[PDB]
Amino acid sequence: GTSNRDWWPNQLDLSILHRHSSLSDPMGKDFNYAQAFEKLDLAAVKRDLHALMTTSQDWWPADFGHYGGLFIRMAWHSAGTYRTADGRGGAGEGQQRFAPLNSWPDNANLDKARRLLWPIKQKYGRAISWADLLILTGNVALESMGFKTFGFAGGRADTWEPEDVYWGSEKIWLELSGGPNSRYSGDRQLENPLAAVQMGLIYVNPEGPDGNPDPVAAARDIRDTFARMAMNDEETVALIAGGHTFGKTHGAGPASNVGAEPEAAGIEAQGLGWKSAYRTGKGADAITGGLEVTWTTTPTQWSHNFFENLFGYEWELTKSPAGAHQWVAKGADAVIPDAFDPSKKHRPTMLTTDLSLRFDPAYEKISRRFHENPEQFADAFARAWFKLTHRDMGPRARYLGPEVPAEVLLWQDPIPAVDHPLIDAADAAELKAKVLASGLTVSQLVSTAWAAASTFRGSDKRGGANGARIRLAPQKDWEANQPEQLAAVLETLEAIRTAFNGAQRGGKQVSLADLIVLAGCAGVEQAAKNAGHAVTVPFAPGRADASQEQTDVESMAVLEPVADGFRNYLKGKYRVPAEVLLVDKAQLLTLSAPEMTVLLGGLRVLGANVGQSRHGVFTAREQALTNDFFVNLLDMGTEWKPTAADADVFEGRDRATGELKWTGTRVDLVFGSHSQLRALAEVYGSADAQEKFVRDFVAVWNKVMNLDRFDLA
Template identity: 60%
Template sequence: MDMKTGEMSGGCPFNGDGGTRGLLGRTNRDWWPDALNLEILVSGGKSADPYGEDFNYAEAFNAIDYNALKADLTALMTDSQDWWPADYGHYGPFFIRMAWHAAGTYRTGDGRGGASSGQQRFAPLNSWPDNGNLDKARRLLWPIKQKYGKHISWADLFILTGNVAIESMGGPVFGFGGGRKDVFEPETVYWGTEEQWVNEGVATRILPDEGKALENPLAAIQMGLIYVNPEGPGGNPHDPEGMARDMRETFARMAMNDEETVALTAGGHAFGKAHGAKPADNFGGAPESEHLALMGFGWLTDKDEIGKGHITTSGIEGAWTPNPTQWGNDYFRLLFKYEFELVQSPAGANQWQPIDQEEADMAPDARDPSKKVPTMMTTADMALKRDPEYRKISERFLNDQAALDDAFARAWFKLTHRDMGPKARYLGPEVPSETLIWQDPVPAGTTPSDAAVAEFKTKVLASGLTVGELVKAAWASASTYRNSDHRGGANGARVRLAPQKDWKVNDPAELAKVLAKLDELRGGLSMADAIVLAGAAAIEKAAKDGGYDISVKVTTGRGDATEEHTDATSFEPLEPLADGFRNYLKTKASVKTEDLLIDRAHLLGLSIPELTALVGGMRALGAVSTHTQHGNRIGVLTDRPGVLSNDFFVNLLSMNTEWSVVDDSGDEEFLGKDRKTGEELYRATRTDLVFGSNSQLRAQAEAFAEGGGDKTFVETFVRAWTKVMDADRFDIA
């Protein structure tokens, strides 16, 4: 375990016992084995999207009456429903929490989580303990969603509602960008290996005394939490150092620095209250486990509890400020004005209460404004006063309201938009004009003429650079793309910049040589276009050498990013610890190497045929990494590397070859010998042999290796290659 990075031995981004369980953790079927299983209806590639493949959400969103939608949301804030009355007569704090928890699952490690697809509607998120009673918030929004229909996705509606909530209570907002398209089934995300939720005896994921760090790519400190346990590490309120440590680590995993962490904590807690009116064992289960008659509601004893105010979510009870529906600086004022004592809520949770609090600083009762009740702070809130670095920031915000306003507005915007990717994907009239560094800006490019492209390709093929070198450089540039948060990709040519140019997977010395030559030859082309076009030229040559006359039609018009456009630190999580397409493995991981290949293919948005064709094609082209524990050229199962052929599949599936483990490889490297003569033929890895051993992947390999399959392979490879090269071209989607 690396205590600095939180990675398990081998740098694996997934802990576990290997295989699917190690890669995915527990699935919805594990948590709720009696839940209705709809998987049979989406097997075979059948879509669950009721709008169909031709639905254009951007067009639908742009046609909405945006001002009318915001007016309806504003009215909803104070239109208290009898079935679920609003605290203080205002739903704003409730909707802020809904939006925050929709976005707050985002993590930088793999870009998954976040608000971009409306996953809070589905298990497991809809039933996480930290999302308690947000089922009611979503149901309060249903009449508005019903009114505007497909013109506003649930994913966009969650975030826009949070913005409107802040505005309706006088708070600052930086802007809003729409464009989040809903999905209609749970996404596959690794949330951890635990078999219990928080508050069920589960230990914190960080235990320095036991050498346990927060596992990559996880960000929450315990299963079922968005961030940290507000009562303290593992529920312990007497560990201030641990509380600050957990907050700093988890917020950093979600792309927030110390100032943003303080601003978000204080800004979010300027509104509303926590709920711990009764012990949690008085209430029913989460939505996924409840009776059909409750219609998707959870956390209730029975339907008569709705509207009674007996609400328990975190178990902590009370408001942070005396004005829970008004933006201001009361949070910091009270935090520093009073000393606090540890008390327990009616639900038995640990929380902190001001000592000898003045009545003027007390909060109104959530249901009876004529009553006054003490305010409170959680152990997490107390960290903003106890931790030296957090305290400096908090004291500055205490004395500078304008600074807090700006910091909170920007941090909220980042929280709710970080997973949307570049600004080009944003829709709507409230998209801020300012471009932010975390949006990975790229200057506009210029589309070259066909003649300029043809001339450049000719120069490249006469440059002395090999097919494998050109293909690897293009792949290194484009394959950083993640469809989880739409970061990475070829646009901007950040493969020329730190940290990407120095990643071992990219064979830095070879990459530098290739990029220098392309820079020399490119003329008026951007480097981003030059890298991709050079890869296309190499593949066209390789295909021609194999007897196929094809054209690799990648788009052009990319721009070149500079160091000023690049937050180098934020790109570090994009470094692949394994890239099965280039047969790269930095070091042995705690899950099977082939699982990491599948995970990477998922982030690239590839189908099984596309995955298979790319692996076989990269091997045939000799485009494998030399900077890996496997050594040079492993998995290149052909005697004509650099030719686009189906040789990899033909030779992998040959019955004349017998495979065995190389003894000192840790079950990672294999030797292929001629069955009759014992002559060594090939060396391969797990990511090679899985295409012969796994029945589904073998079926794909057989289709490419059979008579006539070579044409199918080449067509699939070119289609998949183009898909990866153009994955980040949101302007052409």
């Protein structure tokens, strides 16, 4: 059946905003996963997982009698899709069990690993999510094999449909770079937001770049991809050598023996895939990725044998039984055990990308230090494994259970505890009046609070107004945030704050993070007043102020908005049309299409545009909260044309006289073009809509202000 996507393949896709409705969720509307998890007997779960590690099933026999390696790779892959550019991917939604990730070639035979876990998932039911279970199982694997983990937090709620994620434009799995949809350009520059080198890989190609088995060049791909997954050199070497302390690869025969990935397999395969015609198709005959490497002499026990081997031998380029490039230790004895036959042994082997850790000079220094000091290695790996597996979980307040680490890590964007009474409703009212009396405008107040709160992204739950990080480097200098104007607003609010906190008794005080948000609230109330409407904008106190020392400035860089349609802002010229970027931002903000529409139309008339641009400011009463954006946008008395100076800016002229009425961007005019968005604009542009527009605006404003407020969950 031909669909709208077939006829109009470049049209914007709003369905990405409407996933995760109560329609697709089997749990009741009131189900609270945190409450279910908090009563799980986590210790009992772990004991079952521990027993599972050495209980082999004949449909996928355990290598060396121990599934530990398989499960560690499973957990690593669950986490390893994460990209810092957008926060998308990661383990936090259990997306490995859905398309496309359940069928990525790099996830081959993890369908078996997930299936091994059904009996435990079935036992404990809604009290442990798949998302939590994947990571937990990886921790229990490492613990069972002698490795002390840094901790574990529950709280990743299950999701019930695939996320809409851009994974690249290629139409062939694993396509080598340089094709018609190449994700590389210039001098091996990977396009943002991607964080893998080929479609369907987690990070890099284990043979080397586009299959070229050069460890030095592979190292460049390793470093780039792992940085784009939030990991530095030390963390990267710790993770790869730590992982490859365990288990083995699977490449026992040619890959052409391996059948359809799960989403393409027949219905009788019951959600599994990659069925192999090679000998028994499993166990000793397994084929997963096509390499045949076993790193250590004790693949089911933590050791420092990965580095002993890496540095204790010289390596020769060889081929697996499937034809893949890999490396074997020159002159070595057969000291590596076989996974099924106790009378066979093998020489040490390595991937090209393992050798990267020795032949790249910066990695070499770290690998050497870890080799000489394996306790350093163990600590770095534990910390990195925790970071890896929790990177997308959000604020520490979301972390559940008895194994949460007490140490606060810089990468968490930590927020200090609040240790005083909070302001009450009367205090809030007093503060809003003092804000409005200072002479700060609706435009300043709205813009500042928008800038602070709208860094939040639901993808990894980073950002938001909690912390008052807008007053710190680097947020205070981002162009979208209007640095000079911001500095003036923050100076006024800080003087108001100092004066309020100085008059209190009893320890009550207000954080600047709360006051920024409250001041925006006051601005929205004043704008409503300016339009002849008395409304109260809800406000919840309890944010705290983080320090510069608690703020990693480089990690913060990925939250810079280079495109923010809600402020009519685009930092440069991109390949993706601005309206697509608007919908992408709305998704990150967790907005629906109605919420996006209301919010943008309100912001336009409140003066929230960067640089006071008149684009989309379709009103003669700016700073009054009215539906004028919609009524004027939809007025058929106005004709629109692109400008000669810029195809992305449009002039709205009176159709009869030619007089210039307005200018707008693509982000403005999409609301009058896109058939679904224009239907939403019509509701808010109707003569009966002023009350609705105000109410719905206030509601979405408050939703945005509270996006990071997991302390109130």
